[PDB]
Amino acid sequence: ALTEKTDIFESGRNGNPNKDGIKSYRIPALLKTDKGTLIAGADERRLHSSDWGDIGMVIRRSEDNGKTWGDRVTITNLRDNPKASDPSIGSPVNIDMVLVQDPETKRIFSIYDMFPEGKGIFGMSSQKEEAYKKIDGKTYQILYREGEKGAYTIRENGTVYTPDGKATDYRVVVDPVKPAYSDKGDLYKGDQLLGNIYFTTNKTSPFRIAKDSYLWMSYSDDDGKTWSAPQDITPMVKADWMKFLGVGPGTGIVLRNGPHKGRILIPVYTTNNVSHLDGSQSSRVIYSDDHGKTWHAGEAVNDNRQVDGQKIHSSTMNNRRAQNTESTVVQLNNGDVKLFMRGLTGDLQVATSKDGGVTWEKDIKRYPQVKDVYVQMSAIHTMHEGKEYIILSNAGGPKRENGMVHLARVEENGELTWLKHNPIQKGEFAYNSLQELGNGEYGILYEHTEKGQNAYTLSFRKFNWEFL
Amino acid sequence: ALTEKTDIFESGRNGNPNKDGIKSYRIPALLKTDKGTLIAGADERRLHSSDWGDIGMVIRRSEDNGKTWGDRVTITNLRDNPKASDPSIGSPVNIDMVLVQDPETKRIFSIYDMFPEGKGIFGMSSQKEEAYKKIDGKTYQILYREGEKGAYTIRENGTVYTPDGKATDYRVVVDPVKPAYSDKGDLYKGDQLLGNIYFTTNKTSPFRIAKDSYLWMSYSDDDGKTWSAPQDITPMVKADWMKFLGVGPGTGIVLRNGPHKGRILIPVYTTNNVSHLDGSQSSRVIYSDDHGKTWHAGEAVNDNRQVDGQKIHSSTMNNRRAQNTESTVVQLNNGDVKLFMRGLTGDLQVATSKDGGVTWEKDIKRYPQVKDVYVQMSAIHTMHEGKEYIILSNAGGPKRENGMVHLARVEENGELTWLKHNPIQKGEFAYNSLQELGNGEYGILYEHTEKGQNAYTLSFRKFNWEFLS
Numbered sequence: 001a002l003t004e005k006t007d008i009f010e011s012g013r014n015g016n017p018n019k020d021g022i023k024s025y026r027i028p029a030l031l032k033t034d035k036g037t038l039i040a041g042a043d044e045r046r047l048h049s050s051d052w053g054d055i056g057m058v059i060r061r062s063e064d065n066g067k068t069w070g071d072r073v074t075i076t077n078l079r080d081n082p083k084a085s086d087p088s089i090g091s092p093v094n095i096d097m098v099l100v101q102d103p104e105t106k107r108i109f110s111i112y113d114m115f116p117e118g119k120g121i122f123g124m125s126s127q128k129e130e131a132y133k134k135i136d137g138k139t140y141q142i143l144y145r146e147g148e149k150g151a152y153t154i155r156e157n158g159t160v161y162t163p164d165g166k167a168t169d170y171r172v173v174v175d176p177v178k179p180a181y182s183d184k185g186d187l188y189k190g191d192q193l194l195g196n197i198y199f200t201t202n203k204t205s206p207f208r209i210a211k212d213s214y215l216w217m218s219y220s221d222d223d224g225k226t227w228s229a230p231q232d233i234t235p236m237v238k239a240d241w242m243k244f245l246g247v248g249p250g251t252g253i254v255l256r257n258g259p260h261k262g263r264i265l266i267p268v269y270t271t272n273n274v275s276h277l278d279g280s281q282s283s284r285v286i287y288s289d290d291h292g293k294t295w296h297a298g299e300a301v302n303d304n305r306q307v308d309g310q311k312i313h314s315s316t317m318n319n320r321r322a323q324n325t326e327s328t329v330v331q332l333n334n335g336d337v338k339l340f341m342r343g344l345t346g347d348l349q350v351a352t353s354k355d356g357g358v359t360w361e362k363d364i365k366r367y368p369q370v371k372d373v374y375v376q377m378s379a380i381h382t383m384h385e386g387k388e389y390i391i392l393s394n395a396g397g398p399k400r401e402n403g404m405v406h407l408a409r410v411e412e413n414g415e416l417t418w419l420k421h422n423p424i425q426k427g428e429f430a431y432n433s434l435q436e437l438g439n440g441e442y443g444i445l446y447e448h449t450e451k452g453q454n455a456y457t458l459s460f461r462k463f464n465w466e467f468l
Numbered sequence: 469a470l471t472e473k474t475d476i477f478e479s480g481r482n483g484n485p486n487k488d489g490i491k492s493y494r495i496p497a498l499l500k501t502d503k504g505t506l507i508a509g510a511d512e513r514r515l516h517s518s519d520w521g522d523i524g525m526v527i528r529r530s531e532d533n534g535k536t537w538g539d540r541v542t543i544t545n546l547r548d549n550p551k552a553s554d555p556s557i558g559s560p561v562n563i564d565m566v567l568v569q570d571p572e573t574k575r576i577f578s579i580y581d582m583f584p585e586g587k588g589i590f591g592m593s594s595q596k597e598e599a600y601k602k603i604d605g606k607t608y609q610i611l612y613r614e615g616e617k618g619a620y621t622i623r624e625n626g627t628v629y630t631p632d633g634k635a636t637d638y639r640v641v642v643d644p645v646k647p648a649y650s651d652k653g654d655l656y657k658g659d660q661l662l663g664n665i666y667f668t669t670n671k672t673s674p675f676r677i678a679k680d681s682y683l684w685m686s687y688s689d690d691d692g693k694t695w696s697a698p699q700d701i702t703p704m705v706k707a708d709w710m711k712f713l714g715v716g717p718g719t720g721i722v723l724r725n726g727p728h729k730g731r732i733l734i735p736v737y738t739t740n741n742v743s744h745l746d747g748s749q750s751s752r753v754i755y756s757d758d759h760g761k762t763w764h765a766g767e768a769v770n771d772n773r774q775v776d777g778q779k780i781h782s783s784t785m786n787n788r789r790a791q792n793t794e795s796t797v798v799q800l801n802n803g804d805v806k807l808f809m810r811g812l813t814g815d816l817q818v819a820t821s822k823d824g825g826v827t828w829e830k831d832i833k834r835y836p837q838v839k840d841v842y843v844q845m846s847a848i849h850t851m852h853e854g855k856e857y858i859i860l861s862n863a864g865g866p867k868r869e870n871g872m873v874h875l876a877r878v879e880e881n882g883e884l885t886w887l888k889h890n891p892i893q894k895g896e897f898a899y900n901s902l903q904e905l906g907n908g909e910y911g912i913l914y915e916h917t918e919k920g921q922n923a924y925t926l927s928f929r930k931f932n933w934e935f936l937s
């Protein structure tokens with residue numbers, strides 16, 4: 001039925017670091033690859049357990065269906081500002097990942113947020129700063145220089161150009177080479193390292209990127225063993241009005257049927273400048289139809305949505321209860337895509353797309369038989385004995401506690417009928433990620449603490465249909 | 469040295485329409501063409517004197533340097549919604565024009581605001597509605613259908629397409645043929661007129677455009693005698709964050725020197741969704757380098773502007789005094805572009821661009837010797853006996869009264885030295901447009917009323933260098 005928990009990422013105790021000098025881990029993503037391998041992804045939080053600071057994007061691999069796991073592999077870990085007054089806020093931040101595999105190329109993607117040095121989503125400015133500039137059909141990332149108003153650009157070879165279009169003696173590391181790509185954004189003049197473009201305080205170089213929220217992507221073509229340098233996918237998908245744009249962490253999908261088969265779907269959510277985190281968080285997907293080469297934004301669930309009288313839009317809404325945030329995405333056999341969205345109604349909110357994730361139907365469906373206490377969830381499609389189901393896992397409540405694995409039957413019209421609700425973990429329970437394993441068996445990687453563990457320890461369990 | 473006022477567009481009196489059935493005129497634009505022709509543009513307000521309603525874009529032409537003027541020529545006048553409960557707010561709106569001629573092609577452009585039926589800039593919604601959709605690289609205007617969430621599109625030949633991209637039996641008049649193009653936007657099912665996509669109340673067709681602020685353009689290739697159908701230029705220039713985008717009315721320029729010579733510059737201004745008309749009004753220019761065929765937005769004066777030791781952006785600002793609204797644009801002989809902007813400081817605010825209107829220098833210069841009572845102004849470059857000057861006209865104050873023509877020497881470093889401040893019209897004085905007429909003479913079309921004349925009557929005067937100095 002259900003196995004006992006195996007601890008995959010171990011957090012420290014009583015506010016102290018673990019044996020690796022790491023305080024805690026958060027944000028599980030569980031990928032079951034084509035070769036049977038399980039990739040377990042996490043935020044690795046070295047210094048403290050906040051939503052910022054020194055966080056690396058890390059994975060572990062199990063080649064025996066989750067029994068034993070290899071050593072941590074670091075995808076990305078940007079170097080700290082060695083001059084920051086407060087190291088707790090003195091690192092450029094990567095935070096929250098989504099994992100997915102392309103089933104044709106077998107390429108594995110990790111998509112995650114990036115912010116310059118500071119407090120991440122909780123450090124965002126009230127004012128927009130332009131991040132990119134289009135010059136002769138090429139999009140360049142902008143750099144700002146203290147006491148100068150104009151936009152410098154990073155062009156060919158990482159060479160920095162003046163606002164007026166002339167090459168400088170300065171250059172950015174745009175092809176990072178150090179372990180964990182900790183050299184990305186390093187600012188040189190000739191062969192002299194001066195600082196880093198992601199540093200925002202006590203700078204030793206003249207240049208910095210726009211203070212904003214970014215989305216990065218790294219990929220692996222060797223079953224998660226090694227990873228590419230980070231690719232900045234922001235300018236492909238972030239609209240000029242968006243404040244925050246970030247992933248809904250967990251595991252993305254690839255569409256298996258319909259006109260859009262082969263489409264990679266990555267849950268994301270945005271905020272606007274009208275109400276930001278107070279009334280605007282809005283879920284959507286970004287997608288790629290060319291096996292991860294180019295990315296596009298779908299429309300938000302909240303775009304032209306009717307809410308208590310009146311239409312809203314994600315770019316202009318200010319409605320706490322109509323927010324939807326981190327989400328988990330599933331495709332049905334009839335071609336429909338369901339988006340299970342974290343929200344503030346107390347129960348499960350589901351949006352439906354008829355066109356492979358680009359637009360959403362007018363109604364958000366509420367399922368009062370599945371509680372949602374305002375915490376991430378994960379959901380996967382499953383076939384059992386020729387019958388179509390959805391498995392969804394989240395906290396049972398009243399707080400981030402008592403982990404549940406809910407089983408739904410999907411009807412021919414895509415309506416969901418909730419059959420079973422199975423507690424899987426007493427005590428602390430938060431973020432979780434599900435995968436199908438290959439028999440009637442399923443794996444879950446989740447957040448949980450016991451015995452004074454720092455939030456969180458990430459643990460793994462297998463269950464089967466008899467548990468379900 | 470200063471002629472008596474000649475009335476060009478005459479308002480009615482005591483809230484009554486004039487002889488032509490028109491309550492009032494507003495928003496002068498004066499343009500001296502290649503031919504020597506003077507074109508005077510205006511908002512023609514049929515129903516009342518507010519910032520919405522039934523408003524036509526109209527011109528008159530003078531062929532004798534402002535002495536006599538011909539009959540009204542209507543550029544654009546969208547038909548009213550015949551089913552609207554309140555006629556004063558029952559018409560799609562055009563409002564505020566900029567005129568400019570391309571010196572090479574001789575083409576004359578009128579660029580002006582458009583809004584569907586309602587209260588114009590004072591009727592904008594709190595929530596965005598997407599207005600355009602790119603389908604396989606092609607940009608189409610969206611239509612919304614009663615009882616449906618999805619975006620229909622207006623495609624080739626005006627054919628309305630479903631959200632899934634199927635042709636319907638519905639069609640939009642995209643190539644209007646009626647006088648003043650009053651049929652633009654008409655919605656047909658095959659051969660039967662059903663209603664109009666610009667109507668927002670008591671609709672008789674199923675379809676309507678996004679509720680938004682738009683920018684339209686019409687052009688003349690025959691010295692202002694006839695005009696093209698309106699071009700919707702909005703998607704070329706309006707960003708996904710902009711709430712209002714509209715012209716700073718008057719007369720635009722064509723750059724006459726430097727690497728961007730030939731560039732057409734059109735003052736505009738935006739608001740955002742953070743503070744709209746309370747704290748985000750921000751000047752910039754849109755420009756064309758291909759003789760008016762395609763248009764691009766410059767950056768706002770307020771983009772990356774330091775205010776109170778902190779950087780703002782036009783898209784996110786909320787600062788009353790940092791706003792800059794309608795503006796007038798002038799190029800210096802050194803290549804620099806000056807933007808004189810209506811503002812809330814009580815005095816004249818000027819921005820400088822060194823890249824042909826695309827970005828603006830960090831410091832907005834203020835001149836305490838020219839008052840700004842928060843009203844439109846016009847300014848023009850001029851040369852007198854080998855020396856460079858700018859002439860600017862606006863109200864002297866305290867209110868919108870006491871028209872002034874100000875004269876500045878432009879110094880070698882681009883600094884302006886204000887030399888003379890000459891009264892040109894006592895009593896009411898508001899919007900105005902200046903043009904150099906040649907041989908030391910200048911013309912001005914301006915808003916003024918007397919004895920119970922509805923706001924406003926548009927009058928013309930000519931003056932010479934002697935009046936200036």
Ligand SMILES: CC(=O)N[C@H]1[C@H]([C@H](O)[C@H](O)CO)OC(C(=O)O)=C[C@@H]1NC(=N)N
Pocket residue numbers: 026027043050051052095096113120121122246277281325326375
């Ligand atoms: C980018 C970011 O800050 N991600 C946050 C997330 C976020 O703050 C909320 O969704 C905003 O409403 O909340 C939570 C949470 O547990 O509620 C965890 C993530 N924390 C970490 N990955 N450390």
Ligand SMILES: CC(=O)N[C@H]1[C@H]([C@H](O)[C@H](O)CO)OC(C(=O)O)=C[C@@H]1NC(=N)N
Pocket residue numbers: 494495511518519520563564581588589590714745749793794843
């Ligand atoms: C599009 C529009 O509403 N244009 C308005 C303009 C505008 O309301 C302000 O600049 C907003 O701050 O103000 C004025 C004005 O006299 O202050 C006249 C124009 N009115 C007419 N053309 N009727």
Ligand SMILES: [Cl-]
Pocket residue numbers: 194195196197199202203204205206207
């Ligand atoms: Cl630095």
Ligand SMILES: [Cl-]
Pocket residue numbers: 662663664665667670671672673674675
């Ligand atoms: Cl209609």
